[PDB]
Amino acid sequence: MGVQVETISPGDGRTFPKRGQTCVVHYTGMLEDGKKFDSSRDRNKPFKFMLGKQEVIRGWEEGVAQMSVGQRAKLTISPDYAYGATGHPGIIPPHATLVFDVELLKLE
Helix, strand or coil: CCEEEEEEECCCCCCCCCCCCEEEEEEEEEECCCCEEEEHHHHCCCEEEECCCCCCCHHHHHHHCCCCCCCEEEEEECHHHCCCCCCECCCECCCCCEEEEEEEEEEC
């Protein structure tokens, strides 16, 4: 499958990221069993990426583009939109479905 976006808290419902904009997000990344492997919240510093430059997994590019500013959403991402068959040794196993809790704080 692709990426599924499920709302946790609504945003403004009007402002969606366009290609080339910088998205400022807080996120927590979990394996499908619920094990956390990465979180900007634990570092207390938001994560920024430019939409359309493939600095993040494909599931993020397509998923965050469906969020409005201020929204918190749960992204469920199949391995082809993620780290695939290879995964990431010792962090992400092969063929891993990933779950992301993502809050879109602002656009720059």
